[PDB]
């Protein structure tokens, strides 16, 4: 049934998404065509449970959607990937009352969700965040700022971490759902980036941002716990994204090298090139299987998830650098897509925990 | 599958691991492993149940090979070569011939070898020179083979020989040869880098007459059957490599936690932590791709995935075992610890059942199809 | 002596080139400030012999100039690197009469030179070029086109290879000096590129382009020999450029990781980060030494030059990918330069012969 | 001068050393033929200053000798590499009076020297050594033990580090010349090893080993400082050894792949093989140039470059020798050819004279200073 799912999303991606991926990048503009196609086909947030009108897709299927979209446009693949990132905490730990306000809109395609953890002085060290939430009667008052927020300015709902008790450290962070129209909440300017150019990446500001008491996810002081829980059920989807990029770059190189002739023969006739292609495909398949395994394990209940994400992203970086190479001069131009794929691949090694952090998680598990 | 793993690991750690050092040091057959594998029925679990076998699925067979290789790679070649030396027969042999051979392999009474390579026909196996000529209702084998794993310990041998020099690879046939067939002899063993205890021998055929029913499938399909065999066996060498790497990593985690320099375990250093993470991450990717390739082989382009799984796992093992020696420091460079042997053993996995260059030829041909 | 030279070029590069490098990339425009500073300091073409008013510098000194410029702006470094690429053939084999017309202007900074070998269907396989030259009276008539031409539209002089006898293969190719003002010579559109964005990269067209008989370089039929000789004396300079990029990336990462704190300490206090920095610096220094050795050997009169170029560029691709990684999220933005350095490093593996071609060259020598 | 030196050592090594290398390794016995030839040709310790009867060769020339010996026999290359390691401290910091006693014998080939720093609990963390030296009138009494000692049992002179003040940490360590005939000094059993098998690698024991006051190198408490300075001047020579091993591996692979024919053509006719050969040679030359640069700078008047030269070259040798075994296929995995031994030998170069993890500590400290 994943065979059929893959055929469906690939057909959708190639027809409605792929033709605009070069513009989305070149012009650094939101992938609107992709959003419309994902929303109307119901592929924008398949992970949302059926109870809220979602597909209730299993975790492997969700990875397959992200991977197949990323295979033609990595900025577009951040629509389903951050929809998951921005709703996973709520799903796992949120109250039914809160879930009902948010999930049906994400499930139906009416709203996107973003995830707001990071701050200028708190990236890898997320627990040193400075944004705070102070109770005030029935409300929470948010003050501070966040940065690196994917789909900032396009999302309707934001999962936002803030300090509710500074003296409890990691155990004094809470998570809140913030709506875009909430007073005191503003979206900052977009970053200029190496790749995923069309994906808006913004600062956010909270100046006495008053939100209802029902917006808190779980008990106060459980926000960091929830952040870690979020990442366990999302890191493989960034692995799936890296796998898709890699696959698209390999697909392009195979097609091009077969058709491009030098020395009176296809450049793919040269065993140096054949071996490079083999190495790219071998590692992509290994990375894909570890992604799916990590995803299936997460669903059923740190090592495998960090591994799947670290490995697939390392693989995508090598594969896309090789794919640019196999096109020769044309690979270095915007006329072909592999140049964009290479710039996009680099982010997968950085967000949803840097690959150095993934190695920290992995080694801690091995050595415990 | 978990219960299988627990059972084979216990046997390997209890009955095989204590002899692994001496197996290598003396370059002598792992007899203790053979007795334990044979009597607990772990030596050839792939043989179909119709012939007295466990009829285990191909992933189960990989897990057995992997868990044995984790403690002794020479020993792992008992089940791995039991499979190599019977797979052609299982795939393409007649009931009449299968019934003669497989029950003894199924029971642990007989090991099987696979005799394909010659001095001048390694990668280019189709250029082999050993001949088979039809005589009445018999075949007369003349020639020699080399690099034959478990040579001199095996009872049954799958031998390829030319039936028609004119027909190229379409003029190769495959035959089951028995240790007691007259004019069949075993030559000297190779002096090797690793898997030192696995006998690796030449074989001689001197007017070696065998019954006509010994042929596997039709005359001239022997190379085709050789290629199909590798499709179904390449992942098991992947599994072997995964096992070796796992054992090297297990030894390095245990040792780096215990060994202290500068007032703390050597594992306390982030450079060592990252290297351990790299080892484990890559081992798990290799493992999953081995099991996937095995699952797909059993169900019926296995070409790409089986070559991939063998090539990647063996590359991973080489890197992991090189690292594990490194993590022990000077002790890792001594025979006092097993990681030195593990490194030496890991190297063969990149070479046999198709060198990793040949694996890349198979993979790229599939992609460029 | 070279120490003094390195100090001078570095000071020049820091003060007059570096402040414009971001803008040169972001606006994809020619590094005009770098041109003015290099021309007036006399750093634009120091390889030109003294006989023509040039500096007459040794080949290592030329590499150090290219390296130190590439350390702050790769597009800018193509000024001296392609001034060299576009005059070496002439210098090695051209008549005195021809050299007197071209070289003094390049030496004085009045003219830039370009090198025009490649065509759409003749890249790695340059010998299959289709641009034609036909003798007509005392002149040559050139017809056809070239592409990938660095500094196209900015150069005054172009070294152009063309077929003079179609039946002689590589031995029926000649090389000619073409002047930007020659009738029937026109410059095409600029490529849109992954990196080195400010370096113009253009098609050229020859439409009954009539040039004097004195424009041929050496004897008819020796043009390809002269192209191969050029690469022998230029490939180490692309190694030098890749060393420069890598060094700038490493300088950046050292400065940033010392100042950026997470978990209460500089990120450079992590041993994984320390080891990565050690790896970058070790490979850079190996690459640098092999470049200078190739340069010294070429100048005193295939393997070492191909090795110096392949190795340094593979190193720079690795080092710049790591430098982006070590800046974390900031590395992925245009606010810092490591992202530009990564995009730029990729070209070094492709031009003046792809690293695959370099391995053809090397293995042929080993196996001779 | 260097072109000629290289030619002279290469010819000597090919004639007098190469023919014995396989036996030295296989039988784990000292390379006696190489010692005799290096001694009588005057190549055993060319770094020794002219003032003590030595050749007084520059540091690049000393690397070239070590490199070209290592190219055919790594164990034999440890004669001049360790003759340098076990005298450099003395040369740099010792009194004229002591130098005159030790250096002429090393210069003339009458004596080998060893370096005795490491202990079972003091490897990377050498400053935590436990061997003590106690003053007794004008003399010193040594008590403790060393391990990992190359050429132990063969050397005549040993540079030994010992604690002279347990309260001063690293500044409580001293260095002493110990003679093989000093009473209370004994040599323990040899390690069994992955490679450099013919190189003796021993424990040493000091039991009330009384030595004269003139045997101390430099002032008391500066022995560890002397250890660090020594490594600055010797690390490139292990880079040079790794470069020789890799060069021998590459040379062997070139000659072999050109002559081994499969599929109707030399195996070197395949581009995947050509490219690997190209990668091997390119990295070897980069490694060589950095070693010579490191050596040349050490001589002139260094932390970063000596560590980089050794780390890079040893990493290169490990990759290159793993590749060279691969390129021989089956034959590479056998003792019939030398690439298997070269592979085993390469591994030590990443470990001794400071592991490559320690080299990265040293490099990164210099970068972040
Ligand atoms: C385009 C884009 C998009 C997103 C994001 C980033 C970017 C660039 N992120 C933020 C992302 O998760 C974040 O960038 C990483 O956690 C890394 O943090 P810093 O950028 O602060 O680097 P930081 O300063 O943490 O790291 C600097 C370098 O040091 C290394 N390092 C740090 N600690 C180390 C340690 N203990 N050991 C070894 N090395 C260590 C790092 O690996 C890195 O190489 C995000 N966030 C969010 O909340 N919502 C979002 O939607 C997104 N989306
Ligand atoms: C920005 C920029 C700037 C310049 C240039 C290019 C670019 C992109 N070049 C042209 C450059 O030298 C050219 O891109 C390369 O020679 C490769 O040619 P193709 O782009 O046609 O790739 P091509 O189609 O040759 O190669 C495609 C792939 O096949 C591989 N391949 C080809 N043959 C192979 C073989 N036999 N064995 C193994 N692999 C093989 C290649 O390595 C590559 O990965 C140039 N030119 C010029 O005349 N003047 C200039 O100034 C410049 N400058
Ligand atoms: C210990 C041991 C155990 C066994 C075996 C070997 C060994 C060493 N073998 C034999 C094994 O399968 C054989 O060694 C390989 O197929 C390679 O053949 P050669 O050793 O002749 O190397 P060969 O000479 O074919 O290869 C030499 C080098 O050239 C490369 N090469 C060759 N052709 C190439 C091409 N077209 N493109 C790129 N590169 C190419 C190879 O990759 C290798 O690097 C075997 N056999 C058997 O019948 N029964 C058994 O039980 C075993 N077991
Ligand atoms: C054959 C042979 C020959 C010689 C030598 C060894 C051998 C095997 N040695 C000793 C050698 O120098 C010694 O093995 C190394 O210094 C490493 O010490 P240990 O073996 O105790 O490993 P140790 O236990 O120190 O290291 C184990 C692992 O931990 C790692 N590690 C340790 N500290 C670390 C840190 N701070 N950060 C990151 N990683 C760290 C190491 O890199 C290694 O990977 C020697 N000695 C001598 O005195 N005279 C001699 O002649 C020779 N000869």
DSSP string, D101-167: HHHHHHHHTS--EEEE--BTTBSSSGGG---EEEEETTEEEEEEEEEEEETTTT-SEEEEEEES-TT
Closest C-alpha among B48, B76, B19, B52 to residue B298: B48
DSSP A258: H
Structure obtained using: X-ray
- What one-character DSSP code corresponds to residue D13? I
Helix ranges restricted to H, C109-186: none
CA distances from C175 to C88, C143, C273, C298 (A): 12, 13, 50, 21
Do C148 and C86 have their domain in common? no
Q: D319 and chain B: CB distance < 8 Å anywhere?
A: no
Lookup: tokens for C247: 């060094």
**Ligand 2 atom nearest to C116, measured from its CA:** 48
Ligand showing the shortest atom-to-Cα distance for residue D348: 4
Contact A360, A310 (CB under 8 A): no
Ligand number nearest CA of B339 is 4
Hey, whose CA ends up nearest to atom 11 of ligand 4? Answer: D352
Q: Which residues line ligand 3 (CB under 6 A)?
A: B 114-117, 122-123, 147-149, 192, 200, 348, 351-352, 355, 357-358, 361; D 260, 262-263, 267, 270, 272-273, 326-327, 329-331, 333
The Cα–Cα gap between B271 and B289 comes to 27
Centre of ligand 3 to C-alpha D332, Å, is 10
Return residues 328-367 of B near A (CB < 8 Å).
357, 359-361, 363-365, 367
* Closest alpha carbon to A230 in A21, A83, A360, A54: A83
Q: Report how far residue C87's alpha carbon sits from residue C151's, in angstroms, rounded to the nearest whole number.
A: 13
Q: Where are the beta strands (DSSP E) in chain D?
A: 113-116, 132-136, 139-150, 157-163, 173-179, 185-190, 201-211, 216-217, 261-262, 265-266
Local structure of C109: helix, strand or coil: coil
Which of B167, B99, B104, B177 has its CA nearest to residue B138? B177
Active site positions of A, annotated: 352
Q: Ligand 4: which of D148, D161, D189, D191 to mutate, judged by most atoms within 8 Å of the beta carbon?
A: D148
Buried b (16+ CB within 10 A) or exposed e, C242-253: bbbbbbbbbebb
Which one of A128, A267, A317 has the shortest CB-CB distance to C321?
Answer: A317
| Residue D267: closest C-alpha in chain C | C367
Strand partners, D334: B192
* Resolution stated for this PDB structure, in Å: 2.1
Q: How far is it, in rounded angstroms, from Cα D341 to Cα A119?
A: 55
Q: Please identify, among A175, A201, A219, the residue that sits at the C-terminal boundary of a domain.
A: A219
Tell me the C-alpha distance between C236 and C59, whole Å. 9
- Mark whether C227 and C359 lie in a shared domain: yes
Q: CA nearest A177: which of A79, A81, A105, A77? A: A105
Q: Do strands A185-190 and A261-262 pair parallel, antiparallel, or not at all (unpaired)?
A: unpaired
Q: Which subunits count as partners of chain B given 3+ CB pairs below 8 Å?
A: A, C, D
Catalytically annotated residues of C: 352
Q: Which of B40, B155, B165 is nearest to B103 (CA)?
A: B155
CA distance D61 to D78: 16
Asked whether A90 and A102 are in contact (CB, 8 A), the reply is yes
Q: What does the alpha-carbon distance between residue C28 and residue A326 come to, in Å, rounded to a whole number? A: 25
Of B191, B326, B335, the CB nearest to D350: B326
Last residue before each gap in chain C (C to N over 2.5 A) = 301
For residues A100 and A43, state if they share a domain. yes
Q: State the nearest Cα–Cα gap between C262 and chain A, in angstroms.
A: 6
Query: Can you read off the two tokens belonging to residue C207?
Result: 């439409």
Name which of C254, C258, C282 is nearest D308 (Cβ-Cβ).
C282
Contact D272 A270 (CB under 8 A): no
Closest listed residue to residue C177, CA positions, set C88, C110, C57, C62 = C88
* Rounded-to-10 torsion of CA B315, B320, B325, B329: 130
Count of residues for chain A? 368
Indicate which CATH number applies to the domain containing A204: 2.40.110.10
| Dist CA D152 CA D147 (whole Å) | 9
Contact A223, A161 (CB under 8 A): yes
Residue C188 is inside which H or E element, if any? strand C185-190
Q: Are A44 and A80 in contact (CB under 8 A)?
A: yes
C333 lines ligand 1 (CB under 6 A): no
The residue whose CA is least distant from atom 22 of ligand 2 is: A328
Q: Is the C-alpha dihedral spanning C37, C41, C45, C51 positive or negative?
A: positive
- Report the distance separating Cα D312 and Cα D227, nearest Å: 22
Report which ligand 2 atom has the smallest distance to the Cα of A332.
8
Contact: A282, B368; criterion CB under 8 Å: no
Nearest alpha carbon to residue C35 among C78, C85, C84, C86: C78
Chain A contact for D271 (CB, 8 A cutoff): yes
**What's the gap in Å between A140 CA and the centre of ligand 1?**
28
Answer whether B12's CB lies under 8 Å from B76's CB.
no
* d(C-alpha B322, C-alpha B319), whole Å: 5
| Residue B58 near residue B294, CB atoms below 8 Å | yes
Q: How many CB atoms lie within 10 A of CB C138?
A: 8
Alpha helix stretches (DSSP H) within chain C? 2-12, 21-26, 32-41, 59-70, 74-85, 88-93, 96-108, 223-232, 235-259, 271-300, 303-326, 338-345, 355-366
C90, C112, C134: which is the final residue of a domain?
A: C112
DSSP string, C248-299: HHHHHHHHHHHH-EETTEEGGGSHHHHHHHHHHHHHHHHHHHHHHHHHHHHH
Instruction: Please judge whether D290 and C287 are an interchain contact, meaning their C-beta atoms are less than 8 angstroms apart.
Output: no
| Contact check, Cβ <8 Å, B363/A286 | no
| Integer Cα distance of A206 and A180 in angstroms | 11
Measuring CA to CA, which residue among D140, D148, D143 is closest to residue D121? Answer: D148
Q: What single DSSP character describes residue A212? A: E
* Ligand 4 centroid to residue D123 C-alpha, Å: 5
Chain B residues with beta carbon closer than 8 angstroms to that of C271: 269-271
Give CA angle at A329 (A325, A331), nearest 5°: 55
Residue A281 CB contacts under 8 Å (≥ 6 apart), including other chains: A250, B304, B308, B363, B367
Joined together, the tokens standing for residue D17 give: 């050393």
- Cα(A165)–Cα(A133) distance, integer angstroms: 9
In whole angstroms, what is the distance from residue B130 CA to residue B148 CA? 14
Q: Identify whether the C-beta of residue D80 lies closer than 8 Å to the C-beta of residue D69.
A: yes
Residues in A closer than 8 angstroms to B281, CB to CB, are: 307, 310-311, 362
Residue A312 token pair: 């697939």
Contact present, C361 and C306 (Cβ < 8 Å): yes
Instruction: Compute the distance from residue D21 Cα to the ligand 4 centre, in Å.
Output: 26
Neighbours of A368 (CB within 10 A): 7
Tell me, yes or no, whether D106 and D38 share the same domain. yes
Supply the CATH number for residue D18's domain: 1.10.540.10
Q: Which residues contact A87 (CB under 8 A, 6 or more apart)?
A: A45, A47, A48, A102, A103, A106, A113, A157, A159
> What ligand has the least distance to the C-alpha of D362?
4
Q: Which alpha helices (DSSP H) does chain A contain, by range? A: 2-12, 21-26, 32-41, 59-70, 74-85, 88-93, 96-108, 223-232, 235-259, 271-300, 303-326, 338-347, 355-367
A182 sits in which H/E element: none
User: Which CA distances in Å does A184 have to A111, A178, A230?
Assistant: 20, 11, 26
- Same domain as D203, residue D148: yes
> Cβ < 6 Å from ligand 2: which residues?
A 260, 262-263, 267, 270, 272-273, 325-326, 328-330, 332; C 115-118, 123-124, 148-150, 193, 201, 347, 350-351, 353-354, 356-357, 360
For chain A, report the end-to-end CA distance as a whole number of angstroms. Answer: 39
Number of helices (H), then strands (E), in chain D? 11, 10
CA C110/CA D211 separation, integer angstroms: 77
Same domain, B226 and B362: yes
d(CA A249, CA A230): 29
Which of C257, C316, C332 to mutate: most A Cβ within 10 Å? C332
Residue D347 to residue B329, Cβ atoms within 8 A? no
Burial (CB count within 10 angstroms: exposed 0-12, middle 13-18, buried 19+), residue D322: buried
Chain C hits for A122, CB-CB cut-off 8 Å, are: 262
Round to whole Å and give the CA distance between C6 and C61.
8
Q: SS3 of A151, please?
A: coil
CB of D265 within 8 Å of any CB in chain B? no
Sign of the CA dihedral B24, B29, B34, B36? negative
Q: D71, D69, D100: which is closest to D82 by C-alpha?
A: D69
Q: How many Å apart are CA B51 and CA D295, to the nearest integer?
A: 69
Instruction: Answer yes or no: is the C-beta of D123 below 6 A from any ligand 4 atom.
Output: yes
Nearest alpha carbon, ligand 3 atom 42: B357
- As given in the structure block, the two tokens for residue B14 are 């209890």
The angle formed by the CA atoms of residues D44, D47 and D53, to the nearest 5 degrees, is 80
Torsion angle defined by CA atoms of residues C365, C366, D1 and D5, in that order, rounded to the nearest 10 degrees:
-160
Tokens 């696959």, residue located: A247
Q: Computed over its alpha carbons, how large is the radius of gyration of chain B?
A: 21
Q: A226 and A359: one domain?
A: yes
- Alpha carbons D212 and D139: distance in angstroms, whole number: 5
A112, A129, A153 - which closes a domain: A112
Residue D148 C-alpha to ligand 4 middle, in angstroms? 9
Crossing angle of helices C338-345 and C74-85, in 10° steps, is 30
Closest CA to D365 of C273, C321, C259: C273
Cα–Cα distance, B37 to A124 (Å, whole number): 50
Mutation pick from D25, D130, D194, D256 vs chain B, by most beta carbons of B within 10 Å, is: D194
Burial class (CB in 10 A: 0-12, 13-18, 19+), D4: exposed
Ligand 1 centre to CA of A193 (Å) is: 14
The answer to whether D270 contacts chain A (CB < 8 Å) is yes
- Rounding to the nearest 10 degrees, give the CA dihedral for residues D13, D16, D22, D28: -100
Burial class (CB in 10 A: 0-12, 13-18, 19+), D165: middle
Give me the active site residues of B, please.
Answer: 353
CA distances from B131 to B141, B165, B188 (A): 6, 9, 21
Q: Give CA–CA dist B21/B241, Å, rounded.
A: 18
- Which burial class, exposed, middle or buried, applies to A225 when counting CB atoms under 10 A from its CB (0-12, 13-18, 19+)? middle
Distance of alpha carbon D241 from alpha carbon D65, whole angstroms: 9
Q: How far apart are the first and last CA of chain D?
A: 38
Phi first, then psi: what are they for C28, rounded to 5°? 45, 55
Residues of C in contact with D286 (CB under 8 A): 286-287, 289-290, 307, 311
3-class DSSP state for residue C115? strand
Residue-number span of the structural domain to which C54 is assigned:
1-112
Instruction: Identify which of A273, A270, A328, A339 has the alpha carbon closest to the alpha carbon of residue C122.
Output: A328
Distances (CA, A) of C253 to A346, B292, C74, C247, C319: 16, 41, 18, 10, 10
Interchain pair A359, B277: CB under 8 A: yes
**Distance separating alpha carbons of residues C25 and B212, to the nearest angstrom:** 77
Does residue B170 share a domain with residue B44? no
Q: Is C264 in the pocket of ligand 1 (CB under 6 A)?
A: no
Judgement on whether residues B243 and B363 belong to the same structural domain of the protein: yes
Residue D294's domain is classified under what CATH number?
1.20.140.10
Structural contact between residues D284 and D316, judged by C-beta atoms closer than 8 angstroms: yes
Question: What's the structural domain count of chain B?
Answer: 3
Question: Which two tokens mark A150?
Answer: 């994917």
Give dist(CA B24, CA B17) in Å, integer. 12
CA atoms within 13 A on the CB side of A199: 24
**B155 burial type by CB count under 10 A (0-12 exposed, 13-18 middle, 19+ buried):** middle
Interface test with C, best of D358, D362, D368 (most C CBs within 10 A): D368
How many angstroms separate the first and last alpha carbons of chain C? 39
In 3D, which of C256, C198, C242 has the Cα closest to residue C349?
C242
Instruction: Find out whether B197 and B24 touch, Cβ atoms under 8 Å.
Output: yes
What is the enclosing helix (H) or strand (E) of C210?
strand C201-212
- Which partners does chain A have (≥3 C-beta pairs < 8 Å)? B, C, D
Q: For residues B4 and B60, give the distance between their C-alpha atoms in angstroms, rounded to a whole number.
A: 7
State the Cα–Cα distance between residues C64 and B154, nearest whole angstrom: 66
Closest listed residue to residue A285, CA positions, set B238, B39, C150 = B238
**Closest to B242 measured CA to CA, from B308, B304, B305, B314:** B314
| Pair (C40, C96) in one structural domain | yes
Q: For residue A265, give the H/E element and its range.
A: strand A265-266
Q: Give yes or no: residues D168 and D141 share one domain.
A: yes
The H or E element spanning position D364 is helix D356-367
d(CA B352, ligand 3 centre) in Å: 6
Distances (CA, A) of B205 to B140, B144, B148, C182, C305: 9, 6, 14, 79, 54
Mention every residue, 6+ apart, whose C-beta is less than 8 A from residue A142: A131, A132, A133, A160, A162, A176, A178, A184, A185, A206, A208, A209, A210, A211
According to the 3-state scheme, what is the secondary structure of chain B?
CHHHHHHHHHHHHHHHHHHHHHHHHCCCCCHHHHHHHHHCCCCCCCCCHHHCCCCCCHHHHHHHHHHHHCCCHHHHHHHHHHHHHHHHHHHHCCHHHHHHHHHHHHHCCCCEEEECCECCECCCHHHCCCEEEEECCEEEEEEEEEEEECCCCCCEEEEEEECCHHHHHHHEEEEEEECCCCCEEEEEECCECCCCCCCEEEEEEEEEEEEHHHECCCCCCHHHHHHHHHHCCHHHHHHHHHHHHHHHHHHHHHHHHHCEECCEEHHHCHHHHHHHHHHHHHHHHHHHHHHHHHHHHHHCCHHHHHHHHHHHHHHHHHHHHHHHHHHHHHHHHECCCCHHHHHHHHHHHCCCCCCHHHHHHHHHHHHCC
Residue B263, Cβ density class (10 Å: 0-12 exposed, 13-18 middle, ≥19 buried): exposed
Distance CA D201, CA D147 (A): 8
State whether residue A40 is helix, strand or coil. Answer: helix
A276 and A333: one domain?
A: yes
């Amino acid at each position: 049934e994943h065979i059929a799912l893959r055929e469906a999303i690939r057909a959708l991606a190639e027809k409605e998404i792929a033709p605009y991926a070069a513009e989305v990048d070149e012009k650094a503009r939101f992938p609107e065509e992709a959003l419309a196609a994902l929303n109307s086909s119901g592929f924008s947030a398949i992970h949302v449970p059926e109870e809220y009108g979602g597909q209730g897709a299993d975790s492997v299927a969700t990875c397959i959607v992200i991977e197949e979209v990323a295979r033609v446009d990595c900025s577009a693949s951040l629509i389903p990937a951050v929809n998951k990132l921005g709703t996973m905490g709520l799903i796992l730990r949120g109250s039914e009352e809160l879930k009902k306000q948010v999930l049906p809109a994400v499930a139906s395609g009416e709203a996107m969700a973003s995830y707001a953890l990071s701050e200028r002085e708190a990236g890898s060290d997320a627990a040193s965040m400075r944004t705070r939430a102070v109770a005030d009667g029935d409300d929470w008052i948010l003050n501070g700022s966040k940065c690196w927020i994917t789909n900032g300015g396009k999302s309707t709902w934001y999962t936002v971490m803030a300090v509710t008790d500074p003296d409890k450290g990691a155990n004094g962070i809470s998570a809140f759902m913030v709506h875009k129209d909430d007073e005191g909440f503003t979206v900052g300017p977009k970053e200029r980036k190496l790749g995923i150019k069309g994906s808006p990446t913004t600062e956010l500001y909270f100046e006495n941002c008053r939100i209802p008491g029902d917006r808190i996810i779980g008990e106060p002081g459980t926000g960091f716990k929830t952040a870690l829980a979020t990442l366990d059920h999302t890191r493989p989807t960034i692995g799936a994204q890296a796998v898709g990029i890699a696959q698209g770059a390999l697909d392009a190189a195979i097609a091009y090298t077969k058709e491009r002739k030098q020395f009176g023969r296809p450049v793919s006739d040269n065993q140096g090139v054949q071996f490079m292609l083999a190495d790219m495909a071998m590692k992509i398949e290994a990375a894909r299987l570890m992604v799916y395994s990590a995803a299936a394990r997460a669903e059923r209940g740190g090592f495998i998830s960090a591994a799947s994400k670290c490995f697939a992203s390392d693989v995508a970086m090598e594969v896309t650098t090789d794919a640019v190479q196999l096109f020769g001069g044309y690979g270095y131009t915007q006329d072909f897509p592999v140049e964009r794929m290479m710039r996009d691949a680099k982010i997968t090694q950085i967000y949803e925990g840097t690959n150095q952090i993934q190695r920290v998680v992995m080694s801690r598990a091995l050595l415990r």
